[PDB]
Design a protein around this ligand. Structure first.
Ligand SMILES: OC[C@H]1O[C@H](O[C@H]2[C@H](O)[C@@H](O)[C@H](O)O[C@@H]2CO)[C@H](O)[C@@H](O)[C@@H]1O
Length: 190
């Protein structure tokens, strides 16, 4: 009973910062599909790397473009099973705990409404949010709230004080939460 295949189950993945990235397992981001729709890469603070990732996956877990007020993405689906939405949140020059609090939603539903990246991980590094979804017979299930699925899924984040998401590493893959592997490079395995 062996199951290995991350690149064969991905349906939609986006990193808000640079432009198009393929990570070590085979996960690919598009190119600026939320603010402006068609443009280029913007990096205002590129000499501050992430400590819990790789060099290649550091670019997909560190690069940020720009912010405004109340915004998000659209994911179109037509199949049922276990869909997992894992997104990496990161910061640059903001030191505060329990003052810079944000809101995060999936398909209109509220899940993490008090998101502070400095109080959760500490100073800099990589922050991770794991939210498993179950759609069966044409309806959606988010933890302890049941509703119906109609065409697309939405990721809508609301403002805290000055900024909204800051650094975002969106990754939605399909079939189950026991198939998502994440490790660092090591020479000895025992
Ligand atoms: O100009 C690029 C960055 O602009 C803003 O960052 C501000 C920040 O909001 C403010 O508190 C501080 O005093 O100044 C920095 C820039 O000098 C945006 O928030 C960033 O997304 C931009 O990268």
């Amino acid at each position: 009973g062996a199951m290995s295949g991350l690149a064969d189950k991905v349906i939609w993945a986006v990193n808000a910062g640079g432009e198009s990235h393929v990570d070590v397992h085979g996960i690919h981001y598009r190119k600026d599909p939320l603010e402006g729709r068609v443009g280029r890469a913007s990096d205002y603070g590129m000499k501050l790397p992430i400590l819990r990732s790789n060099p290649e996956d550091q670019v997909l877990y560190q690069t940020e473009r720009y912010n405004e007020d109340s915004f998000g993405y659209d994911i179109p689906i037509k199949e049922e099973g276990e869909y997992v939405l894992v997104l990496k949140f990161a910061e640059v020059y903001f030191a505060q705990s329990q003052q810079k609090v944000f809101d995060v939603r999936v398909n209109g539903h509220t899940v993490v409404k008090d998101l502070d990246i400095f109080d959760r991980v500490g100073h800099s590094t990589a922050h991770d949010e794991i939210i498993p979804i179950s759609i069966k017979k044409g309806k959606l299930s988010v933890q302890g709230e049941v509703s119906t699925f109609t065409g697309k899924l939405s990721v809508e984040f609301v403002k805290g004080y000055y900024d909204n998401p800051k650094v975002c590493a969106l990754f939605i893959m399909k079939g189950t939460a026991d198939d998502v592997p994440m490790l660092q490079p090591h020479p000895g395995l025992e």
